[PDB]
Curated annotation (Swiss-Prot), chain A:
GO terms assigned for molecular function: structural constituent of ribosome
Biological process per Gene Ontology, one example term: translation
Organism field: Escherichia coli O45:K1 (strain S88 / ExPEC)
One cellular-component annotation, GO: ribosome
Alphabetical UniProt keywords: Ribonucleoprotein, Ribosomal protein
Pfam families according to UniProt: Ribosomal_L34 (PF00468)
Protein name stated in the entry: Large ribosomal subunit protein bL34
InterPro entries tied to this protein: Ribosomal_bL34, Ribosomal_bL34_CS
HAMAP family tied to this protein: Ribosomal_bL34 (MF_00391)
Family designation: Belongs to the bacterial ribosomal protein bL34 family.
Amino acid sequence: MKRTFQPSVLKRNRSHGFRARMATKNGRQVLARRRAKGRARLTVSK
Amino acid sequence: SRVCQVTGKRPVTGNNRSHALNATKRRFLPNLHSHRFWVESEKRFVTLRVSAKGMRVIDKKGIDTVLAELRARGEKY
Amino acid sequence: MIREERLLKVLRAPHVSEKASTAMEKSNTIVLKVAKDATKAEIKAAVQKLFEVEVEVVNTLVVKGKVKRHGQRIGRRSDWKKAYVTLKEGQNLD
Amino acid sequence: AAKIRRDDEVIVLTGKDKGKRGKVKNVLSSGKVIVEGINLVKKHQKPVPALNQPGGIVEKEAAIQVSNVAIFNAATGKADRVGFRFEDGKKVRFFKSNSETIK
Amino acid sequence: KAKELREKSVEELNTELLNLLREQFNLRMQAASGQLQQSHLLKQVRRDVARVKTLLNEKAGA
RNA sequence: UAAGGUGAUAUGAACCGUUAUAACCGGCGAUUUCCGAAUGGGGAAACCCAGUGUGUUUCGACACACUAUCAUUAACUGAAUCCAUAGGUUAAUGAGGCGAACCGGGGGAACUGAAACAUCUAAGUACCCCGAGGAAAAGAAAUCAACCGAGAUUCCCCCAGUAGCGGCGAGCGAACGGGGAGCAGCCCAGAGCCUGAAUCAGUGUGUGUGUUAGUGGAAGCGUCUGGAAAGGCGCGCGAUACAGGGUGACAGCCCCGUACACAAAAAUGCACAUGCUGUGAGCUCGAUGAGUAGGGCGGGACACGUGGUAUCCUGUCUGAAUAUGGGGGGACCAUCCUCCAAGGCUAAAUACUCCUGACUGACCGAUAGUGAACCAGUACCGUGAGGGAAAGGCGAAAAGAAC
RNA sequence: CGAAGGUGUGCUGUGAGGCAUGCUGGAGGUAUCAGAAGUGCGAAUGCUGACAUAAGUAACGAUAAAGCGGGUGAAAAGCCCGCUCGCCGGAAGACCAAGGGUUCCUGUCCAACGUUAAUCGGGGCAGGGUGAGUCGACCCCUAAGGCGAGGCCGAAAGGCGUAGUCGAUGGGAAACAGGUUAAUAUUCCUGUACUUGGUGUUACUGCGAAGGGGGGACGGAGAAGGCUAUGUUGGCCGGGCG
RNA sequence: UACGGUGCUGAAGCAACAAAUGCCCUGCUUCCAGGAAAAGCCUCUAAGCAUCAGGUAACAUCAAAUCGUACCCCAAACCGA
C-alpha cells in the first residue's frame, strides 16, 4: 500500500529547507523560534 | 497605499453600528484623487494623489509651498 | 604556479594498505592522503617538488568517514582525500 | 602560595600512618600529596604482555590529603604551621612557631 | 624564541618560516610512518611557525 | 602568579619547567576557513559560477583587493524636446540582521459572564505588525479650582467601590480634594544692540573613585573509643576573624577561606576640574502657530452605552475671530473667575531582567526542583510547524579483586 | 559504646498513636512549649515505575522441500565443501534511477539483536575498499512555475509584475573492446580512438551583436519494405566410443 | 599448488535460414483533436576597427578543474513501528 511519505530530497529541501525558510517572514520566525528552543537541527537541511 | 500626500490622511478603522447597536468593524477611507497640479515656477504639471482636503489646502497656500513641505518630509512627487 | 607554502600543506601522508602496495609495485602509482581542498594539479606539483619525481597523472577520490559508536555515544570519523599518483616509467620512490 | 611543596619533609597528622614522617614525593592538582613510604596500598597489578609487566601484588604509595600532613620543623622536633612573608623582594615560607624561615 | 626572532629582517623571517614549514612537513611524513618517536616535535614546530607569522604581521602594518 | 605543568571522559606516550618568556589568571593586540543580514551573481545554508584591477610566473598559472540593495548628498553625464527634467555612471556617508522582558504607536478576536441571547461583558486582553530606549511615554496649563486659592509630567497611599455609567441587568467605575516619592525648566515662529556671557554634546588631558588579575591574613596539644577523630575526657590559646566549605565521624586554632589591611604595566565606567571644536547667554523692541478653532454627517476616546451630555480625537463636507481677540469652568445663556490651542525640547521619582557578581530562604532534594542534577531540547516521534522522555549515589582512598 | 531509615518482639493509651528493645543500617536525629503548612489516600476507566494473571498457553510471518557424507567447533536440522532433490526463470535472474548511507570486502567475537540453535549474519569490534577530458552531476539553454531592480497596488506585514534572474521531467562536444581486485572500473592496466578549448605558427585576409534570418523544432494512428540484436541448422575444430 | 587459485599455452573461429516490439523512421501514408521553448550550430550584416586585431588552414604544444562512483534498489538495505 502506497504510504503517505514518499521521500524525495530535492522536494524536501524546496519545501522545508533552510533557504525556503529564510525566503519568507514566517519561515524566518519559525527558525528564530527553533533557535530559541535550542534545536540542534535548525532545519531539514542535512 | 491610500494616503493623501499633502495631508497624510490614511484609512482609519471604526464601526458600523446598526439600529440594534451591532458593532462591526469598518474602515473610513479618505477621499483621494490623483490630480495634475500646475506648478507656475517650474512650468510643469506635478501629479499628486491627494485628498479633497489636500486640494483645498493647496488652493489656500499655494502648490509650491505644499511641494516644499513634501520635500522637507522626504516624500517624492 | 602554486606557492611553496601551499604545496607543503597539501600532502598529508602515505597510505599503507595491500591495494596501495600493489599499485606501488605493479603500476608505479603511489597512494597518498592529501588535503581535502587539494586539487589534482596542486597535488602533482607537491609530489614533484617534495618527493623529486616526475608525475604522469593524479587520480583523486574522497573517502567518506565511517560512523562509529564509542560506548553509547554515536560519532562520525572525518572525510579525507586519497590520491593515486602515477609516476613516470623508471621513477623509483624512497 | 602553596605551603607544602615537592621536596619537603612532612609529618602526618591523621590516619593509619599518623605520626610517621617522609619526604613529599609529588603534589597533585586535586589537593593531595604522595609522600614517600607513608600511605601504602597493595595493588593487584593485572599482567600485560606488552610493556614488559609481569603483574603481581605491588605495594605502592597512595595519595593523602595535604591538610592531613604538616611541614616538620627540625628545630622544635614537631609539626608546625607555615606562614608567608617578603624577604628582599621575594616571598618565603616561615614556621609560625619560632618564626624562622624555611630553608 | 620570539624575542630572538624579533631582531630580524622581513626576508630573513620569510626564509625561516619556509624552513619551519619544510621541517613540519618532514615530521608529518615521518609521523605517518613508524619513524617519528618524538611527537612533541610536531607541536613545537607549529607553534614556532605561528610565532613567525605573528612577527611578520607585527612588522608589516602594525 | 608560580613549582609544577601539556582542558575533560582517560589513562598512557612523548615532552616542557623549578626564581623565572613552563603552566595557570587578567589587560591590550594578532590570527579569525566556510554558511548565515550575507552584501559580486546564483543556490537544494555550510555549495556552484564570475567580472574588473593591481602584482608575480619556473609562463602551466597564482595571489590579493574590490564589485549587493535602498536612502541621502555631491560630481560628471543625459531622453522624447529648444532649454530643462526624468533617466544613467561614479564617489562618499548611513542603514539592513539578531536579541528575554519592559515601552510607544498601527491593527485586533473568541471562548466566557449576563445562569438563554443580540446591547453589554470578556478586552483594547490574547495575538499580528512597525519603531525606540536604557528606560520609554508624558511634560511646562487655551490645567484645575470656586469668588479662597493651587501652580508641568510621572509614580505610590487615600478619596471610594463613593459620584456616575449600565438590556439601570451582568457588570463598569472616576474626579475634586488630601498625604507622600521626586521636582527643572527652556527654545523657535526675528530683528536691533551689544559679542563668545550660562547650558549641552562630542573629544583630549588631569584628579578622585570603582571594575577587569591579585597579596598578606590569627591561634592546639595530650589522652580514650575507633578503620579513621574533627567525637569523649583533660588542660590551653586566637578572635575587628565562631560567614561558609573541605579534610578517613561533628574542627575558631589541619587546609581553603572569613574580619581587617594592601594591590594595577594596561584597558575602561562614573563624578567633578580643564583645553579645543560646534552651540549661543543677558538687554530692548516686537511678533504670539488657519483649512486651524468651531459647526454638520459618521465613528472612536473620555468611568460616562446619545442620553438633558459638556471635553478630546477625526473619515467626510464646511469654516471664524485673531488679544478691543480667543479657550474652559459637564446641555444652553448671562455674569464672574481662570487660561492662551492650532511649533518644538526636557533629568528625576516609574516599568522590566536574556545577562554579570555577591548574599539570603519555616523553598525543592531525583515521580520533587527547570522539560533537563546525567553530553537534554538530546534520544525518540512527526512531511512540517511542532511534540519530547527516561536516566543521580562503590569506597575515606581504586586499595576496582594478582594468583 | 551506633543517628535516620528497614525489620521483628514486648508493653501501653478510648482512638489517631506512643514507649522500650533484638537484628539490619552506618550518620545523622531532636525533647519541651510555640510557629507555618505541598500535613495523612483504596477507590477518580487517576498519573509514573515495578511485578503478577491468562501460560510455559497461542504463535514462530506464504504448503518452493528436502536428504546424506565430510569439515570446523564446547556443541551443527540451519554455517563451509561436496553429491543428490526441489522452486523461480517477462523472475524469486541481471543493470540503474529514486530513497537509504558503509549495509560492500577481510579478519575476528556471539552477551544483546536474528521469532529456535548458531561456529553463521545486513549483529558487535578492528582494518580495508569508491581512481573518469569522453558515464552522471556541475556547466550552456530554456518549460510549467518561482524570485524579481525600478514599477503599480496595499493600515503594517505584504500582493502583482517589467527588465532580468532561477527552474528538468526536455535541447546542448567527445570511448570502445579486452585484462585485472577479497572488495572499483566505459574511472586502473593493455591495445586501438575521439572532442573543444586555448596558446604558438606559417598560410591567408573582412572581422565584428544585446540585432536579422535559418536551424534546432517536435501530434495520434496505420502500413509496409530494408535491416540488425538474437536464435536454429549445417559445415568446421577439439574431445568422446559408453 | 597456502586446494582459494596462479603462470604458461591455445584448435577452429565459416555458411545458410529464421528473425524483433530494437534501428533506417524526428521517415512515409493518413486523420483531426492540428501537435514546447531557448541555447549550442549555420548564416547576415551594424556600430566599430582598418592594413592591427579577429576570422579558417593545417601543425605543434598545453587543457579539460570540481563533486558522484562501494553496496541494496519489486527489496531483510527504500515507503510500510
